[PDB]
Amino acid sequence: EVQLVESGGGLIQPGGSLRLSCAASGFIVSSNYMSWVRQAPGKGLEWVSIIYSGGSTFYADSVKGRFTISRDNSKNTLYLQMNSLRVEDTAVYYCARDLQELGSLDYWGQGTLVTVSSASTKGPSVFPLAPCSRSTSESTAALGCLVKDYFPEPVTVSWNSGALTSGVHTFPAVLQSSGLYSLSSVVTVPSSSLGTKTYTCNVDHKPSNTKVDKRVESKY
Amino acid sequence: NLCPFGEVFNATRFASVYAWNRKRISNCVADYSVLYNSASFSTFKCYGVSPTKLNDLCFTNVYADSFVIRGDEVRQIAPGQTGKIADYNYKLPDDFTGCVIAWNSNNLDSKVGGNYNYLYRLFRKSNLKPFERDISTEIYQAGSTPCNGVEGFNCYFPLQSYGFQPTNGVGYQPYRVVVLSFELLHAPATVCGP
Amino acid sequence: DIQMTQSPSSVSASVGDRVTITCRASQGISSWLAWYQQKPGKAPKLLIYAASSLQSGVPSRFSGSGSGTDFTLTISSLQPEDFATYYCQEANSFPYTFGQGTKLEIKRTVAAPSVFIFPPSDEQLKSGTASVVCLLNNFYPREAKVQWKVDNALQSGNSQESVTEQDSKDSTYSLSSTLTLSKADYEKHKVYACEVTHQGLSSPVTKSFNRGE
Ligand SMILES: *[C@@H]1O[C@H](CO)[C@@H](O)[C@H](O)[C@H]1NC(C)=O
């Protein structure tokens, strides 16, 4: 069969350098147009670079003079050398075989993630989102945890060590202007349980070896 | 004897760029001024010669190459360029001495449904040499397994149709191109002009 | 360059529907257009090349059409695995611009959000920052507007929001909006409110608290 596997993604500081690889099976990379395409988190797709079988190379304006596409025929592998990296280069990077206007990009790899950031790795603070004392509500109360100021992704959140799964919404993280992430996890529960059932959100941030359990209860 | 430039610039059919035509121009008087001072031409770039002084010059031979390409590909018909036209279809040498002349031909070379008769070479393993003309139709092997002349996955006909339509943006529209290259030897000069 | 405009950004459908998605290029590109499908956390997959040619292995309910400036992707009768985002692409000139994408999501009955506001914890306030969270739970359709108000001044530029993926069971969305202030700014004001506008509410619903009660 035919395959494309990217690797070499990771965390790098602005101004840094990184090389991605794309190992191909089936296709002969040196006989194809090969392109790199990228997708910034939550955004669309952007073609970045192409290499011709005969060796010509071309680049999107946002990477020209910083990125270099190349190949090693012997290893049937495609490369993108990324220099002078910027925050806005943060993206999943895909290699694809390119059939131009004959057949477009017909096979893509799974992609490798590049994160360009100056932030230090940091475990989150966990704050309670306390259920409102006005418990008339609907007969249903809402409560949760604010998981604030961590880097990098991801955090995982459970409730009552996994015993509480129904009605849980753990939101996607937002990147703050500080370069640290923030996330909320909420659960709707019966207002009648607020006196009696303990609600504890369990927060794991592996990059920082952080485990936090936060008991969330009605306030004063 | 006037040089038969009319047969070249005013021909009725023009070649596909992969099978570009060459016309040998010899033993004749070349009035280049009727050309450079004309409104007809969106591109008129000369290299190794000044376009104004053409009529004061003698040459051993002159070749006139012609073909149709896209308007945004005319930039590739120049020394030092890269791209699908320069690499695989028509290549000018670094030390090119001559003129590159193009005009928009959307009126004659487009059709309402799309004109698909004009082709270019999409697949080739290595770049063309200067003034090399490849008319192979061999099925192109893009995968690990030989195609032995059968089309299919990873096994592609090497030529691609342009598909010109009158409503194309101007970069996508057809342009007719004439490349005059000026040959000089230690030989009699047979093309002089005025 | 050439602009590629996909509209609408979002399309609501049920299984079995005929769905058509459009892509418009700013100049005539003949038939040089590709359509891709992408699902969350997965690579895009090619559906249609050269405007109307169906890619090998792609179900035949997918078809493309158009030539010049206006192009369409049609799915003849929608299937569950078809809910995804769709992208067109200029295939025949640098820089091979992709359209901004059309999301195909599951139609269901209108459902108003239940709204909740959460004051900053005292624990966080000691550290010098205040996060105020507004929660919009289990609503449909996706379109909703959160307006933060601080002593009735409309707050702009100091909030971020986040939305879940459509729920696998009941097809609703939930949304979180966080207003961030310094401790000193937070203590300058009394009434904190988030006001929510949504198709399922007859008029905007406001949830509020008074700082320190
Ligand atoms: C081609 O014909 C036009 C008139 O149709 C004329 O003006 C032009 O000089 C001709 N080009 C030649 C003879 O090279």
Residue numbers in the entry:
A (entry chain A): 1 to 220
B (entry chain C): 334 to 527
C (entry chain B): 1 to 213
Task: Paste lines from the article.
Like other Class I fusion proteins, the S glycoprotein forms homotrimers on the surface of the SARS-CoV-2 virus particle, mediates recognition of and binding to the human receptor, angiotensin-converting enzyme 2 (ACE2), through its receptor-binding domain (RBD), and then induces the virus–host cell membrane fusion. Therefore, S glycoprotein is regarded as the primary target for interfering with the virus entry process. Among them, P4A1 interacts directly with and covers majority of the Receptor Binding Motif of the Spike Receptor-Binding Domain, shown by high-resolution complex structure analysis.
Three heavy-chain complementarity-determining regions (HCDRs), two light-chain complementarity-determining regions (LCDRs), together with weak interaction from the light-chain framework region 3 constitute the interaction network with SARS-CoV-2 RBD. The buried surface area (BSA) from the heavy-chain interaction in P4A1 (781 Å2) is relatively larger compared to reported neutralizing antibodies including B38 (713 Å2), CB6 (734 Å2), CC12.1 (723 Å2), and CC12.3 (698 Å2)16. However, the BSA from the light chain varies significantly, with P4A1 (414.6 Å2) compared to B38 (495 Å2), CB6 (334 Å2), CC12.1 (566 Å2), and CC12.3 (176 Å2)16. Specifically, the interaction network is mainly contributed by hydrogen bond and hydrophobic interaction. P4A1 binds to the epitope on the Spike protein that locates directly at the receptor-binding motif region of SARS-CoV-2 Spike RBD, hence inducing steric hindrance to the binding of the Spike protein to receptor hACE2. As high coverage of RBD residues involved in hACE2 binding and large BSAs are also observed in other neutralizing antibodies with IGVH3–53 usage including B3817 and CC12.1, CC12.316, this may represent a class effect of the IGVH3–53 antibody family. In surface plasmon resonance (SPR) or ELISA analyses, the binding of P4A1 with the variants was similar to binding with the wild-type RBD or S1 protein with similar affinities or EC50 values except K417N variants.
